[PDB]
Amino acid sequence: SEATLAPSFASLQLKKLELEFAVDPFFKKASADFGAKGLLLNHLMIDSQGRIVFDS
């Protein structure tokens, strides 16, 4: 069983996961809502500070 087993579990380890990506939900909604009626400023929403929110 010596050579069939691996030692320490570090030989079967890993530390970098394939954590696909983050894509923003505002982007996903803007894709669905936008041509000339989804002008991308009709589409957007205002903010409490007083800006246009595309980045979450």
Numbering used by the authors: 241 to 274, 278 to 299
Authors' own words:
The condensin protein complex plays a key role in the structural organization of genomes. Based on their homology to ATP binding cassette (ABC) transmembrane transporters and the Rad50 DNA damage repair protein, the two globular ATPase “head” domains situated at the ends of ∼50-nm-long intra-molecular coiled coils of a heterodimer of condensin’s Smc2 and Smc4 subunits are thought to sandwich a pair of ATP molecules between composite catalytic sites, each composed of Walker A (P loop) and Walker B motifs of one head and a so-called ABC signature motif of the opposite head. Each head domain (hd) can be subdivided into a “RecA”-like lobe that contains the ATP-binding pocket and a “helical” lobe that merges into the coiled coils; they connect the heads to a half-doughnut-shaped “hinge” dimerization domain. Smc2hd and Smc4hd are furthermore connected by their binding to opposite ends of the Brn1Cnd2/NCAPH kleisin subunit (Onn et al., 2007).
Because Ycs4 has so far been thought to assemble into the condensin complex exclusively through its constitutive interaction with the Brn1 kleisin subunit (Onn et al., 2007, Piazza et al., 2014), we mapped the part of Ct Brn1 required for Ct Ycs4 binding to a high-affinity (Kd = 0.70 nM) core region of ∼175 residues (Ct Brn1336–512) and to an extended region that includes the preceding ∼110 residues (Ct Brn1225–512). To reveal the interaction between the Brn1 kleisin and Ycs4 HEAT-repeat subunits at near-atomic resolution, we solved the co-crystal structure of Ct Ycs4 bound to Ct Brn1225–418 to 3.3-Å resolution (Ct Ycs4-Brn1Y4). A marked drop in the quality of the electron density map in the second lobe because of crystallographic disorder only allowed modeling of a polyalanine chain into unaccounted electron density alongside the tip of the Ycs4 U-turn, which presumably corresponds to the high-affinity kleisin core binding region. Localization of selenomethionine residues based on anomalous difference maps and secondary structure prediction nevertheless allowed the assignment of residue numbers for almost all of Ycs4. A feature apparently unique to Ycs4 is an α-helical extension of HEAT-repeat motif 10 (“proboscis”), which showed, however, no apparent primary sequence conservation among Ycs4 homologs.
